[PDB]
Design a protein around this ligand. Structure first.
Ligand SMILES: *[C@@H]1O[C@H](CO)[C@@H](O[C@@H]2O[C@H](CO)[C@@H](O[C@@H]3O[C@H](CO[C@H]4O[C@H](CO[C@H]5O[C@H](CO)[C@@H](O)[C@H](O)[C@@H]5O[C@H]5O[C@H](CO)[C@@H](O)[C@H](O)[C@@H]5O)[C@@H](O)[C@H](O[C@H]5O[C@H](CO)[C@@H](O)[C@H](O)[C@@H]5O)[C@@H]4O)[C@@H](O)[C@H](O[C@H]4O[C@H](CO)[C@@H](O)[C@H](O)[C@@H]4O)[C@@H]3O)[C@H](O)[C@H]2NC(C)=O)[C@H](O)[C@H]1NC(C)=O
Ligand SMILES: *[C@@H]1O[C@H](CO)[C@@H](O[C@@H]2O[C@H](CO)[C@@H](O[C@@H]3O[C@H](CO[C@H]4O[C@H](CO[C@H]5O[C@H](CO)[C@@H](O)[C@H](O)[C@@H]5O[C@H]5O[C@H](CO)[C@@H](O)[C@H](O)[C@@H]5O)[C@@H](O)[C@H](O[C@H]5O[C@H](CO)[C@@H](O)[C@H](O)[C@@H]5O)[C@@H]4O)[C@@H](O)[C@H](O[C@H]4O[C@H](CO)[C@@H](O)[C@H](O)[C@@H]4O)[C@@H]3O)[C@H](O)[C@H]2NC(C)=O)[C@H](O)[C@H]1NC(C)=O
Ligand SMILES: CCCCCCCCCCCCCCCCCC(=O)O[C@@H](COC(=O)CCCCCCCCCCCCCCC)COP(=O)(O)OC[C@H](O)CO
Ligand SMILES: *[C@@H]1O[C@H](CO)[C@@H](O[C@@H]2O[C@H](CO)[C@@H](O[C@@H]3O[C@H](CO)[C@@H](O)[C@H](O)[C@@H]3O)[C@H](O)[C@H]2NC(C)=O)[C@H](O)[C@H]1NC(C)=O
Ligand SMILES: *[C@@H]1O[C@H](CO)[C@@H](O[C@@H]2O[C@H](CO)[C@@H](O[C@@H]3O[C@H](CO)[C@@H](O)[C@H](O)[C@@H]3O)[C@H](O)[C@H]2NC(C)=O)[C@H](O)[C@H]1NC(C)=O
Lengths: 136, 599, 138, 594
């Protein structure tokens, strides 16, 4: 299986992830690691696309002690609204993004959690998959 | 192994790490998806076996060399995709051969000098994709064919200036569209686009629109995409910004995600000949009143903004408007009353996902919209529809309120007046299906979606609301937790041909209700069908396509008649691969196709 | 295994120039724009290769043959520490190059018949940068 | 399969071997690893852990995609990491932390378009950062990017079109910083961007508008400015107008190679008044204008590769303070004239090589008045006719080089006679006539002579010869002269030598007699016809420091037994041992004499 990378490490806080796309790994990092996540945080991302992303969606499922908690879906790129400069890139293009995502602020209650993140396009093709662990 | 995506004509070989074309692949192959394989060198020999290719995708195959005469024997090649290859050199005649090569993708191939592209056989090109390269001048080489060029994509490159000399290169083209998205354009020599040959231009993410407009002086464009992105650096549009616009003509402008510094009616001074305006996610809390410079607008898009009352758009400004989109409003949108009253010619209105919630809907809230054909109120907070709630919409043709809870007092008939209405989507509206007069008025409706609502006792009776929409062709009743459908429930439905009962809990006897129908698309996937009694087996055989997938189907002798039927009619059966036995344990998981029983 | 493939540098009429790489490690892409008996001065070429040696210093050796007899040998420097003649001088080992521009040749009425030319690019430590076994046919 | 031990247990070369991992062969003690052209898609903490003492690591073109966290944690002495030519997808934040003093990082042609891609964590000790041939368009560094010790910053062949004051302010923490912009098409520079005194040197090679550049560099102090162009670069034309911006700045050294001067007047150099070095190489010059006044304080002028007809056309009057003058590689017959450099009283270096010079009564009038000249280079020229006392008028000369320029000297003339301070003379392939005993008369104090490629009567150096007239020599090169023998008492009278090169002749063991009176030299006898080394003169070899007997048909019968035990005993003292092998007998042919 793919290696477990460290998205970040401030103090006792740290966020680990590993790619659950069997075809490839990818590179991800967050810039400030804090309990109090500011809004409009900055990320870094490095990957080669295996699908066109004119339409691109994010699914997030959050887990605690193997049972589940919150599920949502948000669109990143839509035909009538590319939110990001990288929208509408083609399958086969390499990407490096270093910039903001538009997250509202939120805390994270203390506790060890596993988050499962999935980026996919309109045909439900996998663009990227992270099995992530947040450690308090 | 590759995948036969279509009989002898299309195959997929992606991510297989192949170093050569398989002997498996036949002469008759016309579409080959060959991404993520390993072809360092490409030659006359590489694709000779496959003489009839029409579409060849070599994305990300690590190609370094494309040698001479590679495609000599490939007369019908239409599209070649070379995206993502570290190309070192392409021979002069490397792409000659095809009689009508119309699309070449050279995206992210490392090109910084356009002289690198072999011109020999490009005179039939309709689209050339050069995005994410290391390019800094759109100036094409001399004797580079451009006559049939209709799309020319230059995204995410290093183009900072466009000159008259540069654009003159493209003079042979007709109706050409160019994409400059993600190039930081610092200047354009004025008049570079005077040529009438330019249909559409995109300058996405550009940090100085004044510069752009001044450059496009005296030009005629179908559309101009000047939208920005989240990640793009912060600017602020002004009335001043658009001064250059009234020395040019564009039918369609997009200004997505921008911030207007001091929005006045004066801001739109030069929008007088614009026909479509898109202000999506422009941080608007309203529009100014009395514009006068959107007098000839036909299409306005105000999606993803922050309005509080609908009247704040000041519709007075755009009398000639045909289509109005206010989808995805970011806070409770109060529709008000008589707010769109002035928009006498409106035909499309999308209010979906805009956190709207209304009380005595919708005659007042849709006052005077005599000619509306499409209304979308889906994904909203609850709506109370009165009797004859669209009486002020007699020409409505498609109404969509999916995922918007409807509150209707039995026995009101909310849609009575809508006699020209053919498509109605009430999915997940939590409709009270008791009200036999819910769907009154809709004798001539053609397409009804009642997905994810619910019927008393989990059952559709002899008597029921569908007896008011008799002329239907498409009926969707999926996810209604139906346990049963009475034998006569759908007598009275004269012309059905698409029936979706999937994702309920129906059993085989429920197929009785279908006996009087012929040649439908019948979807019964994900139900609780086990044994299909033989006497009502001809009900299935009377149809065109059947889906019985994801059912706990029975594979004992008690279901023998159904199993011989299924094998006999395999061709008529959709989603066959996922149609498998539950009983007995030995055959659990076995596809019905493969069941071998003796009785 | 197999030797590198013979590519066509050009083909005008009955004239044609073929070459094959004699660097065992790798091929390279080359082409001349106008193919004529009368070679104009300052002709334009096209070249594609990955460098395996630093070329701050770079020298060209040319040996010409005909009827398998030796008719001329010379050496010319392409890049020197005190004179980079080309924009690509001083590139590092490992860099990919694409050059499409002039070299500073002079005239040369190519005489009738057939010619075997051996061209060798090398740096100050005599490390191979590129090697062509070329054939000229009229 | 196998790497190469380039130096004992410390340096190895593993290039082009397609390795997917570090070999177990490679030892703990490795400090320099050249690992180019191998296959390391991913790089990790485990990749280089066996090799804990690396100082220099070259991973060029290894198809690296990923450089994962803590890769170099255990590599405290890493000085240089070379990543050129790898398709990098992502580098972890701590991927280069570990080394205590990482001084050089090469990220050339690695696909970088956003400088945020480079992990800053452990870069504060960087002395050089190489970012050429990437997809970059702004030299603006990220905030909190260390620049204090940055001394070289290479931005070649990128897509930089504008440089702003904001951009350059990023680099304010640097001191004596040098930047290379060669091959970027610079369309504008915000004026004053380089007012900061921290900038030592800038290169703007191939740039198509020097007016724009100079205007940008207004009010700046630079050591040097490289504004040369190339063959392939598009055609411009320099004017007096072009350089107007130059006299609102200060630069010691300017290069304008390969440019074309539209209307060269003395007015063209109005703003060169504080320039100390000017290079006009291959500038299509047929001469220089007379009476410039604006190269009054020049010390170094380079006019190489131009097209002069007569030397006087350079109008030397213009540059009295000149020290070094280079006119190498002239593209047509250069006539030296007479008294042409007479005004250049302080000249110290003069290079006239490869300029197709055919002097004939040389060189007192050609070199009139050049009293302080120390270095003269007339190599690779057509024949010179050297006067008796050829160089009276250049007396304080120190190094004279005429290699490959046929000297015509009518015996018994002494052309070098006055050159009392000459310490290095190169007459290689000059086609001398060594028969003249007086050819080197007056060179009693010379310390280094090169007579490579000349001939001798009978291919033999007798008791009496021209070398007992240069009695002091330390370095003597007599290689590739076709010597069959040297007389026993031929080098007596030279009692100083410490470097003797007799290689590439047909000398034999009995020629070693001539060395008996000497001690501790570097003795190179490679590529001769030595077979048996007689034992009585074996101590002549043992008296020396380093010996090279490689490429000799050395004898490996019992008749050479004494020499074979000597050679094994003294292996350490023997240079090029690997290529020193037997000729006889057939059984041992090719065997290393070890
Ligand atoms: C009238 O207007 C409505 C409302 O806009 C239109 O609604 C559209 O309907 C079409 C047709 O049914 C849908 O198309 C299909 O889309 C999927 C991908 O769907 C993904 O998005 C879903 C919706 O996301 C928004 O809404 C959800 C629900 O509230 C919300 O939670 C999300 O966060 C998101 O939020 C919005 O925020 C703003 C609010 O102001 C919006 O405006 C903004 O735009 C944001 O949308 C989402 O639910 C879904 O996730 C679910 O399903 C996935 C699927 O696996 C699952 O993973 C999750 O767990 C969830 O269960 C997705 O993320 C696409 O894949 C389909 O593609 C199929 O068909 C196409 C062609 O049709 C083929 O190319 C393919 O082969 C493939 O088979 C399909 O395109 C669309 O989703 C929907 N749009 C919106 C915005 O809701 C309606 O069409 C209009 N009517 C008419 C007549 O025009
Ligand atoms: C005084 O000035 C003279 C004259 O310029 C200086 O002469 C220099 O001397 C140094 C030291 O001996 C030489 O350095 C070594 O160079 C080799 C590479 O040599 C290559 O170039 C050779 C010369 O080329 C020009 O001249 C020849 C001969 O006429 C000509 O045919 C060429 O075409 C070329 O022409 C010139 O055109 C113009 C004429 O107007 C010139 O101005 C212009 O600059 C052009 O030069 C060339 O002969 C040689 O080819 C021969 O050898 C190769 C070797 O295999 C063989 O393949 C060929 O078949 C030929 O037989 C080469 O192309 C370099 O490899 C050496 O590197 C070693 O040493 C260095 C450090 O010293 C180490 O890094 C390495 O480990 C390595 O072991 C070495 O640097 C130099 O060649 C020469 N320069 C010139 C221009 O001639 C002299 O140095 C000055 N004196 C003083 C005291 O400073
Ligand atoms: C190419 C792919 C690049 C990946 C960029 C994805 C950015 C989109 C994330 C924004 C979603 C935030 C949101 O609005 O959700 C509401 C809820 O707000 C949240 O709680 C935010 C959760 C965001 C999690 C971080 C996303 C990282 C993307 C990596 C995917 C692999
Ligand atoms: C409620 O049901 C209706 C009826 O099926 C759904 O309408 C369908 O909406 C989709 C997409 O919004 C339309 O598809 C589009 O077709 C056009 C034209 O060919 C094409 O350009 C687009 O790419 C897209 O595929 C579709 O035509 C339309 N169906 C009908 C019959 O009009 C509607 O989406 C449902 N609502 C929700 C919220 O799901
Ligand atoms: C004739 O013989 C002389 C004597 O050796 C040769 O002189 C040598 O010239 C070379 C190169 O031109 C000098 O090498 C240089 O050294 C400097 C300083 O360390 C370094 O910066 C350069 O990279 C280069 O290696 C060398 O110093 C010089 N030797 C001496 C003793 O001065 C000369 O080149 C010979 N002539 C010809 C045509 O071969």
């Amino acid at each position: 299986a793919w290696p477990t990378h460290t998205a970040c490490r401030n103090g006792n806080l740290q966020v680990l992830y590993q790619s659950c796309d069997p075809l490839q790994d990818f590179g991800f990092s967050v810039d400030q690691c804090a309990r109090q996540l500011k809004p409009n945080i900055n990320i870094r991302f490095g990957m080669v696309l295996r699908e066109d992303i004119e339409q691109l969606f994010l699914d997030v499922a959050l887990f605690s002690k193997g049972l589940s908690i919150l599920n949502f879906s948000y669109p990143v790129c839509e035909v009538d609204l590319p939110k990001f400069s990288f929208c509408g890139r083609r399958k086969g293009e390499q990407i490096y993004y270093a910039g903001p995502i538009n997250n509202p602020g939120f805390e994270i209650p203390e506790g060890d959690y596993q988050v499962l993140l999935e980026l996919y396009n309109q045909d439900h093709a996998t663009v990227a998959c992270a099995n992530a662990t947040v450690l308090y | 192994k590759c995948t036969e995506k279509e009989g002898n004509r299309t195959y997929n070989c992606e991510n297989l790490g192949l170093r050569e074309i398989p002997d498996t692949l036949p002469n008759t192959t016309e579409v080959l998806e060959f991404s993520f394989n390993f072809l360092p060198t490409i030659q006359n020999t590489t694709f000779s076996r496959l003489i009839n290719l029409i579409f060849l995708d070599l994305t990300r195959c690590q190609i370094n060399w494309v040698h001479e005469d590679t495609f000599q024997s490939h007369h019908q090649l239409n599209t070649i995709v070379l995206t993502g290859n570290p190309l070192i050199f392409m021979a002069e005649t490397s792409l000659t051969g095809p009689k009508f090569l119309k699309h070449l993708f050279l995206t992210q191939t490392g090109i910084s000098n356009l002289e690198f592209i072999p011109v020999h056989n490009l005179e039939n090109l309709e689209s050339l994709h050069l995005g994410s390269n290391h390019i800094s001048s759109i100036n094409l080489p001399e004797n580079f064919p451009t006559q049939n060029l209709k799309v020319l994509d230059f995204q995410n490159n290093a183009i900072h200036y466009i000159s008259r000399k540069d654009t003159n290169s493209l003079e042979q083209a007709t109706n050409l569209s160019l994409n400059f998205n993600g190039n930081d354009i610092k200047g354009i020599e004025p008049g570079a686009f005077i040529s009438k040959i330019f249909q559409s231009l995109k300058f996405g993410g550009s940090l100085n629109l004044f510069i752009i407009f001044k450059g496009l002086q005296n030009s005629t464009l179908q559309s101009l995409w000047l939208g920005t992105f989240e990640d793009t650096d912060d600017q602020y549009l002004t009335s001043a910004t658009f001064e250059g616009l009234c020395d040019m003509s564009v039918e369609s402008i997009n200004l997505q995600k921008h911030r207007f510094s001091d929005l006045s009616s004066s801001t739109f001074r030069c929008f007088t000949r614009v026909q479509e305006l898109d202000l999506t996610a422009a941080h608007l809390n309203g529009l100014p009143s009395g514009i006068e410079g959107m007098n000839s607008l036909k299409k306005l898009v105000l999606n993803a903004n922050s309005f509080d009352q609908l009247c704040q758009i000041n519709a007075a400004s755009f009398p000639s408007l045909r289509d109005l989109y206010i989808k995805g409003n970011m806070r409770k949108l109060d529709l008000g009353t008589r707010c769109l009253e002035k928009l006498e010619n409106l035909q499309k209105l999308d209010l979906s996902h805009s956190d709207i919630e209304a009380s005595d809907c919708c005659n007042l809230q849709l006052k005077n919209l005599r000619h509306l054909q499409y209304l979308n109120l889906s994904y909203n907070e609850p709506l109370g529809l009165e009797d004859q709630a669209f009486k002020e919409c007699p020409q409505l043709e498609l109404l969509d309120v999916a995922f918007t809870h409807l509150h209707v007092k039995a026995p009101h008939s909310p849609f009575q007046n809508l006699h020209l209405l053919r498509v109605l989507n009430l999915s997940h509206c939590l409709l009270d299906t008791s009200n036999q007069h819910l769907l009154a008025g809709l004798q001539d409706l053609r397409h009804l979606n009642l997905q994810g609502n619910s019927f008393q006792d989990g059952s559709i009776s002899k008597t029921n609301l569908l007896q008011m929409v008799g002329s239907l062709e498409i009926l969707i009743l999926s996810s209604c937790n139906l346990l049963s459908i009475d034998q006569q429930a759908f007598h009275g439905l004269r012309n059905v041909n698409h029936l979706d009962l999937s994702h309920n809990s129906l059993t085989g006897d429920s197929m009785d209700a279908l006996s009087h129908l012929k040649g439908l698309y019948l979807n019964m996937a994900s139900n609780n069908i086990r044994i299909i009694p033989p006497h009502l087996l001809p009900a299935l055989s009377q149809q065109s396509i059947i889906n019985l997938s994801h059912n706990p189907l029975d594979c004992t002798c008690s279901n023998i008649h159904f199993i011989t039927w299924y094998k006999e009619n395999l061709h008529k059966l959709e989603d066959s691969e996922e149609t498998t036995c539950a009983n007995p344990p030995s055959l659990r998981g076995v596809k019905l196709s493969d069941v071998k029983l003796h009785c």
